[PDB]
Amino acid sequence: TTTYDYIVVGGGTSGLVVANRLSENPDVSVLLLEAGASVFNNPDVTNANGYGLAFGSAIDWQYQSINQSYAGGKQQVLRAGKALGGTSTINGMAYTRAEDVQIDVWQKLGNEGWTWKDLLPYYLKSENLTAPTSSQVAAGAAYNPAVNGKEGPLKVGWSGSLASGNLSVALNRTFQAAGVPWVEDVNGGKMRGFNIYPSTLDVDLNVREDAARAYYFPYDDRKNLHLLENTTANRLFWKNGSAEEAIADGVEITSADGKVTRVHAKKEVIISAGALRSPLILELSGVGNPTILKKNNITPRVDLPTVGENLQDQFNNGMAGEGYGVLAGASTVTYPSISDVFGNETDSIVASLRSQLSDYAAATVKVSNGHMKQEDLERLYQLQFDLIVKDKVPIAEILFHPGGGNAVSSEFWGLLPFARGNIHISSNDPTAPAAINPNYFMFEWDGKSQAGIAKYIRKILRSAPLNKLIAKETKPGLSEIPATAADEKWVEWLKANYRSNFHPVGTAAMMPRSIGGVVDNRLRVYGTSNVRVVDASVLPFQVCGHLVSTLYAVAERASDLIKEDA
Numbered sequence: 162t163t164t165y166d167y168i169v170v171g172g173g174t175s176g177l178v179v180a181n182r183l184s185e186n187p188d189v190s191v192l193l194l195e196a197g198a199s200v201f202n203n204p205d206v207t208n209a210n211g212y213g214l215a216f217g218s219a220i221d222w223q224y225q226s227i228n229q230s231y232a233g234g235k236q237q238v239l240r241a242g243k244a245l246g247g248t249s250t251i252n253g254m255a256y257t258r259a260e261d262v263q264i265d266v267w268q269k270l271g272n273e274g275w276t277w278k279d280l281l282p283y284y285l286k287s288e289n290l291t292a293p294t295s296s297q298v299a300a301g302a303a304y305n306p307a308v309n310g311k312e313g314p315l316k317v318g319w320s321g322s323l324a325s326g327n328l329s330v331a332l333n334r335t336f337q338a339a340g341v342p343w344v345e346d347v348n349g350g351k352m353r354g355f356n357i358y359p360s361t362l363d364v365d366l367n368v369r370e371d372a373a374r375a376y377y378f379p380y381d382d383r384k385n386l387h388l389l390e391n392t393t394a395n396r397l398f399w400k401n402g403s404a405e406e407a408i409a410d411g412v413e414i415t416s417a418d419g420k421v422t423r424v425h426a427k428k429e430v431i432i433s434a435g436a437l438r439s440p441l442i443l444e445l446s447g448v449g450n451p452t453i454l455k456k457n458n459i460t461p462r463v464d465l466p467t468v469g470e471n472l473q474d475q476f477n478n479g480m481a482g483e484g485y486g487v488l489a490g491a492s493t494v495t496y497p498s499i500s501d502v503f504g505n506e507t508d509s510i511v512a513s514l515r516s517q518l519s520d521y522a523a524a525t526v527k528v529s530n531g532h533m534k535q536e537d538l539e540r541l542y543q544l545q546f547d548l549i550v551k552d553k554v555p556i557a558e559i560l561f562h563p564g565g566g567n568a569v570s571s572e573f574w575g576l577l578p579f580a581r582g583n584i585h586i587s588s589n590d591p592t593a594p595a596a597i598n599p600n601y602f603m604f605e606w607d608g609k610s611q612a613g614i615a616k617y618i619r620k621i622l623r624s625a626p627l628n629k630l631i632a633k634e635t636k637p638g639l640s641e642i643p644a645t646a647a648d649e650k651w652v653e654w655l656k657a658n659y660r661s662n663f664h665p666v667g668t669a670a671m672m673p674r675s676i677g678g679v680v681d682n683r684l685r686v687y688g689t690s691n692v693r694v695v696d697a698s699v700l701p702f703q704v705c706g707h708l709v710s711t712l713y714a715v716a717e718r719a720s721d722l723i724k725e726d727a
């Protein structure tokens with residue numbers, strides 16, 4: 162009665178794709194475990210304009226970091242969805258992908274079959290784009306038909322009430338004048354430009370299109386798909402046979418009544434609990450760094466000491482201005498390259514960055530206590546440097562939002578900081594909060610590029626024709642940060658005001674085992690026959706865009722690889 166073909170741990174963004182796709186075969190039983198519950202009727206979730214409302218609610222995990230010692234010492238909340246649909250139920254709904262070359266880098270580092278060309282069909286498979294109406298087109302909405310799916314479970318589109326307004330027009334003009342042109346679609350692998358970006362939105366219903374509305378509810382009549390809500394997976398348990406290679410037998414779970422039981426998988430266990438939980442589930446299962454496992458009285462089943470290592474996150478800051486009159490229009494994204502941000506000063510930045518890479522690697526070696534090697538980190542950091550410097554991938558995302566009335570706000574983040582940190586269990590008790598350390602601001606580039614982006618936004622606000630609409634900068638403003646402020650003043654302000662960008666990746670990184678990878682190119686955990694991780698943990702580097710689009714694609718492709726292996 163407790164045995165299924167597949168168990169999917171975590172009914173979130175990625176997990177629901179896998180469960181949907183594997184359950185397409187009516188002879189295959191799939192169990193979805195989700196710690197949260199349906200949010201189908203939760204108004205903080207459905208509200209197309211509700212971003213932020215669910216923060217700190219019962220559907221926000223509100224994980225917390227350790228003291229961020231490079232960023233001024235304060236702990237940071239790392240938000241995540243506790244709900245059927247996971248973090249897709251609380252996020253900002255922005256749908257943007259990745260630069261083609263940064264996916265190509267996955268195959269370059271040794272992950273066979275992972276390139277932009279290979280992944281594109283899976284972005285398409287996931288997506289159902291509603292074409293813009295004539296009023297949305299007038300507002301600046303656009304897409305390239307060749308790179309947007311029409312039939313996928315995930316509805317994508319623009320707010321029915323998108324309208325032309327003075328702010329978005331002026332932003333387009335002002336960015337073009339700065340050398341950054343409008344692009345019709347940031348989702349065809351070339352992200353550089355200004356764009357009126359689409360959202361994970363059911364345009365007809367006018368509700369947020371979360372992963373459960375996309376991949377679960379339309380298919381909940383399937384008799385071979387089983388869901389356990391309010392059910393927490395604690396750890397995997399293993400078959401007791403002869404092979405050195407570990408074979409997962411099942412998952413230990415805790416139900417709502419607090420009872421602890423076992424469910425079993427005949428084929429595979431897929432862990433999709435998020436970048437801040439999936440590596441913990443591995444550690445509690447005996448897969449991880451033996452020193453950490455032994456300190457917590459867990460016998461290692463697999464010696465894989467980079468479980469929870471290579472944590473990479475971005476950090477988010479905000480600026481604001483005030484108009485002479487009412488400011489209106491679409492929200493806009495700009496993806497500037499390094500030369501867009503730093504202009505005729507880029508060569509000095511590149512030289513300084515180039516000179517710092519070996520030192521960044523050496524610092525990062527110690528973060529994992531030597532479990533990533535100097536040589537390996539130098540090569541990984543060189544790949545990131547080359548994307549920034551040679552391929553000119555965007556180094557920032559800059560959002561502008563009308564704030565109602567005369568307010569305009571910008572939120573922005575450096576896309577490719579070098580800081581790596583980690584996440585590890587704090588005890589053998591599955592309910593104990595983990596030690597999460599993203600190492601924000603660890604490296605000079607990380608903070609100084611963020612300062613360069615903030616300065617760029619200050620310059621944009623004061624540039625023509627936008628400056629015809631903007632009376633003053635209000636945040637930070639010229640009192641807090643004088644026109645003559647040194648870089649340190651900017652960095653200090655940024656450290657005082659930043660938050661996590663809630664973009665963590667890399668804690669079960671897809672890389673060859675010999676360079677510190679946790680999963681292979683089929684997302685199988687090294688040392689196991691039948692355990693996979695399918696969620697943001699597996700991305701080996703940050704991507705330029707917003708995570709769900711890529712996680713849906715990765716989960717779509719992973720589903721085919723699982724099917725092939727069966």
Ligand SMILES: Cc1cc2nc3c(=O)[nH]c(=O)nc-3n(C[C@H](O)[C@H](O)[C@H](O)COP(=O)(O)OP(=O)(O)OC[C@H]3O[C@@H](n4cnc5c(N)ncnc54)[C@H](O)[C@@H]3O)c2cc1C
Binds near residue numbers: 171708
């Ligand atoms: C505030 C915020 C804003 C964001 N803005 C955007 C945006 O605009 N656009 C975008 O594309 N991305 C955005 N992101 C990022 C994006 O939403 C996430 O990266 C993505 O949803 C993560 O997907 P996932 O599959 O890795 O994990 P999740 O979607 O977090 O799924 C993990 C699931 O596992 C469950 N779970 C955890 N532990 C257990 C356990 N032990 N047992 C059973 N279940 C468990 C969780 O409840 C959750 O449902 C945002 C994120 C946040 C937090």
Ligand SMILES: OC[C@H]1OC=C[C@@H](O)[C@@H]1O
Binds near residue numbers: 183184185186189724
């Ligand atoms: O490929 C065979 C089966 O493998 C796993 C799940 C099912 O969806 C497939 O039909």
Ligand SMILES: OC[C@H]1OC=C[C@@H](O)[C@@H]1O
Binds near residue numbers: 513613
């Ligand atoms: O850290 C390397 C460079 O990164 C960005 C701006 C410069 O101030 C730095 O020297």
Ligand SMILES: OC[C@H]1OC=C[C@@H](O)[C@@H]1O
Binds near residue numbers: 254560572662707
């Ligand atoms: O839509 C903007 C959001 O997108 C990504 C994560 C959050 O930090 C941002 O506010």
